[PDB]
């Protein structure tokens, strides 16, 4: 997690200068203290009156980037030198001597106070504690690619209008940057009836004209300064995916307007370039959590229902007769659902054979090139007849290049007139071209598939579903394959030929790959291989010592009824077996020549052969150093469960009463070892140990409770 004192991620401030020493330490005669200086005192007075660790070490990364923003453009300032110590400390604080590597990649990212590095920490210490899988390395192959992550922030810092009223996305801090642009827009036909010279006294016009038609609504310029409410996404697909050209009848004036703040960005990232400071810090940490959220939705995913289904390799020649009508009907009366292609001809398709799909089940029309976070709602309105979808209707005629018909209107059209319930399923964050890499196809996919799953879904309603095929199937994906939308849904993937046959999508099992990945410089793995922390504190018995009467009821527990008897006879032979008790020891590490001899008179008394245990453990000694101490048990197993034996506890601080050798589940043997013992972050590896690897066997290095070196 962790915290405290003893979890190697408590994020302490022992090491961490207070505002106060850093005046002594900056000092510079005759040189007050200036803005850039101020930001930096007032960030650190935050970070040492921060008490929740995820927020201090979230501030911690904010104050980095300060202190290189003040580098970069103040390289001169004597103030430095006691600045770069400063910027040590904090990455001392958070980065342990062993998280090296994990740290040259999480600080490469630029903007280290955009929310990444404290997105990507977190997910670091909960992987290395091993509370969480495997997710760290891909998270940041995420953010090296992402093209708002990993870009150098150059947007707009400064203040929003009160006046505005809408919230607040991009922003062109300069009107006059519209006028150093390649293209002359107050030239073009037909601009001419227009009386303007450049292309920001357009500006003006361009949104007059775009908001009498209920367009570009969110935008306004204030004193010089040019204020977007709408999203990236939502403006490509409605004013240019391409495009319209022409006209007509979503017209010339937003695409101008589009047009010309694509030249302005120029080699940028568009958000890079225009975003406020505000929301480029909310993207980055909400594409983080919504691309974790699609990692785990493919995490351990089972093909076995769909392939019983669907898989079968003759499935293909299966599609079909077969016979049109006795299929469809298999998709909404056994299937519930089947998938399209995102193509005019499926749509021409499942538009000809609409009479049969109604005539039963048919409920749900979803298709994924429409946006839900956008136009949700003015589909309803549409569904209500009430031409207040000025957006929908954008996208829809950029959807089908130019419509009449159809045929994605038609679609929604036949939806309305049929009373057939229409939904989008796309997610526009990160829905612009190109897509060049896995991981921006990834997050896109995801999202799609985390409304699918979500507001489909009925349990009531059968559906159809229209999608790109790069969305049905199978794609590469982190560590794993990321099943496709059709997998999720348990329907089958069809698409439909230029002849106008239509059967089934295989899903190739080379699309069910990993993403070629090449390895972070010097990874070190995070998560420890083999065996777990037992927890990041020191332990301690919750009351007295335990006693014969306190393990009583701990062992069973379990999971079974008795059994339980045929626990008990097999225990009190164990203990009254004379020569089980002959072997018994009180000797430090006296664990190591015993746990074999128990194993050994384990066998001959037929008791099955258990893997055995191991407990490592801190132990504070003198100054700030800490030594290693480690127990071993034989066990024997039983009915999917492990029960320890371990004729050597005595070893530790016990109370008088209880008896000489100890029996309990390894779980329970592993706690109760380490809190009589008061251990400091124990480590438990479910495998007995032997002279040799028992004595060289300690926690990880990184569990090894630390101050920093310079207090």
């Known amino acids: 997690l962790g915290g405290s004192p003893y979890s190697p991620f408590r994020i302490g401030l022992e090491g961490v200068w207070t505002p106060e020493v850093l005046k002594a330490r900056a000092s510079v005669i005759g040189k007050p203290i200036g803005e850039s200086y101020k930001r930096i005192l007032a960030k650190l007075q935050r970070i040492h009156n921060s008490n929740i660790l995820d927020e201090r070490q979230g501030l911690m ?9 003040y580098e970069e453009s103040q390289p001169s300032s004597e103030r430095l030198n006691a600045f770069r110590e400063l910027r040590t400390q904090l990455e001392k604080a958070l980065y342990l001597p062993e998280m090296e590597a994990l740290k040259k990649q999480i600080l490469q990212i630029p903007n280290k106070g955009s929310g990444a590095a404290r997105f990507l920490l977190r997910t670091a210490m909960n992987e290395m504690a091993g509370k969480t899988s495997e997710s760290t390395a891909d998270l940041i192959r995420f953010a090296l690619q992402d093209t708002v992550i990993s870009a150098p922030f150059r947007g707009y810092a400064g203040a929003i209008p009160e006046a505005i009223d809408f919230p607040v996305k991009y922003v062109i801090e300069d009107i006059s940057v519209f006028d150093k642009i390649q293209t002359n827009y107050w030239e073009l036909p037909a601009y001419e009836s227009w009386n303007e010279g450049s292309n920001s006294a357009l500006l003006p016009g361009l949104l007059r004209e775009s908001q009498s038609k209920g367009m570009l609504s969110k935008c306004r310029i204030i004193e010089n300064s040019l204020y977007i409410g709408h999203s990236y996404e939502e403006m490509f697909y409605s004013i240019s995916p391409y495009s319209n050209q022409v006209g007509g009848p979503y017209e010339l004036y937003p695409f101008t307007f589009f047009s010309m703040l694509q030249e302005v960005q120029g080699d940028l990232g568009f958000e890079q370039a225009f975003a406020t400071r505000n929301f480029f810090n909310t993207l980055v940490s909400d594409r983080l959590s919504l691309m974790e959220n699609t990692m785990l939705l493919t995490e351990s995913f089972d093909y076995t229902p769909w392939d019983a289904i669907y898989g079968d390799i003759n499935y293909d020649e299966q599609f079909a007769a077969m016979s049109i009508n006795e299929r469809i009907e298999k998709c909404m009366n056994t299937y519930r659902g089947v998938a399209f292609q995102n193509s005019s001809k499926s749509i021409d398709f499942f538009l000809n054979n609409l009479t049969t799909f109604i005539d039963n089940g048919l409920t749900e029309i979803a298709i994924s090139d429409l946006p839900y976070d956008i136009v949700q709602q003015e589909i309803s ?34 939806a309305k007139d049929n ?7 796309g997610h526009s964050d990160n829905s612009v071209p190109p897509f060049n890499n896995p991981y921006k196809s990834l997050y896109y996919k995801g999202n799609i ?5 979500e507001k489909l879904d009925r349990e009531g309603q059968k559906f159809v579903v229209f999608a790109d095929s790069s969305l049905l199937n199978s794609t590469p994906g982190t560590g794993r394959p990321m099943p496709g939308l059709v997998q999720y849904l348990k329907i089958p993937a069809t698409v439909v030929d230029s002849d106008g046959a239509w059967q089934f999508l295989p899903d190739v099992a080379s699309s069910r790959v990993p993403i070629e990945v090449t390895e972070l410089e010097n990874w070190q793995v995070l998560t420890p291989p083999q065996g777990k922390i037992l927890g990041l504190k020191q332990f301690k018995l919750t009351a007295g010592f335990p006693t014969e009467q306190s393990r009583l009821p701990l062992l069973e527990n379990s999971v079974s009824e008795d059994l339980r008897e045929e626990l008990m006879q097999k225990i009190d032979a164990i203990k009254n077996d004379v020569k089980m008790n002959s072997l018994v020891s009180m000797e430090a590490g006296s664990c190591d020549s015993v ?20 407990i490592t453990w801190w132990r504070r000694e003198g100054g700030m150093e800490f030594s290693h101490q480690m127990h071993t048990t034989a066990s024997f197993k039983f009915a999917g469960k492990e029960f320890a034996v371990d004729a050597s506890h005595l070893q530790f601080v016990h109370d008088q009463l209880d008896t000489t050798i100890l029996i309990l589940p390894v779980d329970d043997w592993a706690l109760e070892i380490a809190q009589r013992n008061r251990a400091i972050n124990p480590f438990v590896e479910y495998v007995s140990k032997t002279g040799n690897m ?18």
């Open 61 to 69: 990364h904010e104050l980095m980037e300060l202190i290189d923003l």
């Open 381 to 414: 309105q549409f569904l209500q007849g009430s031409n207040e979808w000025k957006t929908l209707d954008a996208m829809l005629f950029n959807l089908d290049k130019g419509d009449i018909n159809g045929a994605f209107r038609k679609l929604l059209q036949s």
């Open 419 to 425: 009373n057939i319930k229409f939904r989008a399923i």
């Open 449 to 453: 598939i985390a409304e699918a799953i």
């Open 595 to 614: 746990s074999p001899k128990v194993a050994a008179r384990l066998k001959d008394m037929g008791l099955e052969a258990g893997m055995g245990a191991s």
């Open 694 to 711: 028992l004595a060289l066997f300690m926690p990880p290095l990184f569990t090894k409770p630390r101050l920093t070196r310079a207090l």
